[PDB]
Amino acid sequence: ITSDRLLIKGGRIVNDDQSFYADIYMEDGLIKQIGDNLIVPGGVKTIEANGKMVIPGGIDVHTHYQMPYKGMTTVDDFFQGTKAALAGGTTMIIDHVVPEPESSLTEAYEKWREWADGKSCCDYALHVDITHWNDSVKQEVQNLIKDKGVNSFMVYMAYKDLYQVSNTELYEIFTCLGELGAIAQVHAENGDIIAQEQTRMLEMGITGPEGHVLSRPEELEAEAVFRAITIASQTNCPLYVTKVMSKSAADLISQARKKGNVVFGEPITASLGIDGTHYWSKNWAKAAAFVTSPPLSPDPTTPDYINSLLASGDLQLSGSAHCTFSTAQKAIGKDNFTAIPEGTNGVEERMSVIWDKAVATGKMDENQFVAVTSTNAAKIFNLYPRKGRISVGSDSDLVIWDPDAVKIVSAKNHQSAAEYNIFEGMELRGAPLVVICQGKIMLEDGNLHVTQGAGRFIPCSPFSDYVYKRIKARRKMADLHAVPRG
Template sequence: MAHKSRILIKGGKVVNEECSERADVYVEDGIIQAVGLDLQTPAGTRVIDARGNLILPGGIDTHTHMELAFMGTVAVDDFYTGTKAAVAGGTTMILDFVIPQKGASLLEAYERWRNTADRKVCCDYSLHVAVTWWDESVKREMETLVQEKGVNSFKMFLAYKNVFMLSDHELYSAFSHCKDIGAIAQVHAENGDLIAEGAKKMLSLGITGPEGHELCRPEEVEAEATQRAITIAHSVNCPLYVVHVMSKSAAKVVASARRNGRVVFGEPIAAGLGTDGTHYWNKDWAHAAGFVMGPPLRPDPSTPGYLMDLLANDDLSVTGTDNCTFSVCQKALGKDDFTKIPNGVNGVEDRMSVIWEKGVGDLSQDPPPGRGL
């Protein structure tokens, strides 16, 4: 018989969503077998003394982009380094995004992501699939992905004009099909047309630095797209998941919709819960560029606390990171034009600690039930 790995985590306080309680945790071959006091375990079980410590379930990062080819370069976190960082920070599962180019097969892109990830991952993972264009072949491939591959979430972009963005008519068709095949629709909610015009305006005014990134895509651009996506999804009775809710304005739209009975879920991310967009005006260009992501962090310093309060109230639902890391040299592709700065920040290792620090606080106190971890 193969040797089994047995671990007893003893004397800690177990924190679950519904409560926290003093309990031991018995793990066999990586699977939790029992939680309780005075557990009886086989001889030779390794015992970890957790007295004075908290025991949390492994976290799930709902939004990552490992080794994504984007804006003329490739994210530096691959599926090995990225998931290794996740585990180091207490996250034991990630959900990455398959993002096919316009005109490309969703199924072929999915298999390519799987082949890349399977050889490298250090933790559990699953995949969302993006719909970046629309015709009958995309519709058929979505059905195959649901029925044969277990995919149950598809992401649509209202931003990145001429790259990933869908029209309202295409969104209506995609949302309708998600409803028909039992999948949830996801959206990157920013008005791509207004961003394109805003970027032209900023550059014409001589604003080329990272601050231009936020100035050309203000809160109302995110809020408008969020409201539009919710309206379209509701018209076809399709559940909607809004990724990376970054502003108070967009968060209010999600919260209001939920309170009015709409089936919509909002996802703030670690960066948006942990800091704000004042960094874009830092005099050190590399520092400012390091925070460039879409949608941008908001310069209103009260935004992180506001988003955290809505997360605690269940007006926002889960937390991801949008982990899509680029080096200083890669960010420098946009040294003279902010529209060419690769969009993305880190966070997969820090998400759990950011939520704990900002959402729970003093570790000496009894923790409230965890939300969005």
């Protein structure tokens, strides 16, 4: 875990629970001291913060680095993708292991570990996607939680005849994951109806990217979410809705939380920063750059409403779902949108987008910003307070943040290998100046200083208090009752 001593002076420290002035001293990957007039060795490297903010580093809970799809890989791998993370203030990522149906979960995990251990600039952890379900899979799941530092698995309600699962299967999986202390994630979209609406759009000769969005209107995201929430509630399992893109999906989550259901919602940079009118762009490749599932909503009031609910705590946390394909790989579907590979950028811009859209607009303050950028992630995934908090003993991943900075986003300038950036030409308030990860300065003066494979896998235990205390209480509370009769 070795790093130099590091001292940051005159900083204003912003955590999710309060802000305060103090100096921070770091050593060997851990924060050692916080306060004034700190007693420290001489000739230690010192950064002068001058009252600029110091925050916990971002935790992007959703990535797809160098993800397999049909004999291709996404263009940003674990190395270049995490450079893109650190560039934008994110010091940890959580990626999705995707086993082939009938493939082994554990084998896919080993493989993903090898890729990541070897290339990642920063710490990371892993979700494991359950792309098919049967008795051996159920055993692997158990083994991954016990021996492998996984506590999060994702099922698919979409992709009919590929990954899609029946209602019985959902019920059995949520029952299992709940019993084991895991988080049940969902890709919540109704694959059965989408299959029909795709065929209808193609019969109507709408093969461009506009047919992607039109074949998955938000009604079908909504339905899938309502069903998942229902089943998660019958099986007393926590649910986590990934990639929240529509208003109606976010209402349902808000509505379910108020009722007392244990549900989390994960908007992504895309839904928080832009909308879906660009599927209608005359430039085909630009339209295809936005193809991701679920799609960006065409209702332009959507980004504002999603930031409003992230501000209110009705959505709890943000990720990016970074999946990047080259113009060339996207072109594979130039005659049929269903063949366009799905994914966009967003890892580098996540924090800037939310600051620009939710903070600078007076929706949330800097403390709730930290929450939705790192601190809630940490609690959900059982990384708290090691991550998502500046306090003594916590890992020394953190960021000096400039609320008055202004940047234009361009593909010209971004770390991503892709030629397109869906936020191209956008002007964002708020950006990082300095990034420390693992106690080491990894960004300063617009220069990255990274090392490939430095990142460690962070094992995530199950049963995080944040998620499971109310579930435990409900389990034990339960005493159903016969009516005793003659």
